[PDB]
From a paper:
The signals are triggered by lymphocyte surface receptors and further transduced by a multitude of effectors that converge on the CBM, which is a macromolecule complex that consists of caspase recruitment domain membrane-associated guanylate kinase protein 1 ([name]), B-cell lymphoma 10 ([name]) and mucosa-associated lymphoid tissue lymphoma translocation gene 1 (MALT1). The CBM complex plays a specific and essential role in the activation of nuclear factor-κB (NF-κB) and c-Jun N-terminal kinase (JNK). As a scaffold molecule, [name] recruits [name], MALT1, protein kinase C and TRAF6 to form a multiprotein complex. The [name] domain is located at the amino terminus of [name] and is able to associate with [name], the key first step in CBM formation after stimulation.
The crystal structure of [name]-[name] was determined at a resolution of 1.75 Å using single-wavelength anomalous dispersion (SAD). There is one molecule per asymmetric unit. The structure of [name]-[name] contains residues 19–109. Each molecule contains six α-helices, and they are compactly arranged around a conserved hydrophobic core, which is the characteristic fold in the death domain superfamily. Helices H2 to H5 are arranged in an anti-parallel helix bundle, whereas H1 and H6 flank one side of the bundle and cover the top region of helices H4 and H5. Of the six helices, H1 is the longest and is slightly bent at residue N29, thereby separating the helix into two smaller α-helices, which is similar to the [name] domains from Apaf-1 and NOD1. The significant difference exists in the loop between helices H3 and H4, which is longer and more flexible in [name]-[name]. An area of clustered positive charges was found on the surface of [name]-[name]. The positive patch was formed by residues R35, K41, K69 and R72. In the crystal structure of [name]-[name], this positive patch is stabilized by two sulfate ions through multiple hydrogen bonds.
Author numbering: 20 to 109
Write the structure that this text describes.
């Protein structure tokens, strides 16, 4: 609830700048989302606005407990270093 605050207060940058497809293979491999979660994220319409493109992914991760939080953070550390620093305040 408070741990997730780090993601939620940065949800705007995360929702725009994450390309979900880059993250899902690692998230799935770590078992924090499944094939169907990935489907929902990958099959979502490609809109003119990218502002909410990773919105669905975040909302799914929000339901995945501290494991989800920690694995998501490492996925940012791997793939989106500036976003990782944003979330962790470093």
């Amino acid at each position: 609830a408070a741990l997730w605050d780090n993601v939620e207060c940065n949800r705007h940058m995360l929702s725009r700048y994450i390309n979900p497809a880059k993250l899902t293979p690692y998230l799935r491999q770590c078992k924090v989302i499944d094939e169907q979660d990935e489907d929902e994220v990958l099959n979502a319409p490609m809109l003119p606005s990218k502002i909410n493109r990773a919105g669905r992914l975040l909302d799914i991760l929000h339901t995945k407990g501290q494991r989800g939080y920690v694995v998501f953070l490492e996925s940012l550390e791997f793939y989106y270093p500036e976003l990782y620093k944003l979330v962790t305040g470093k």
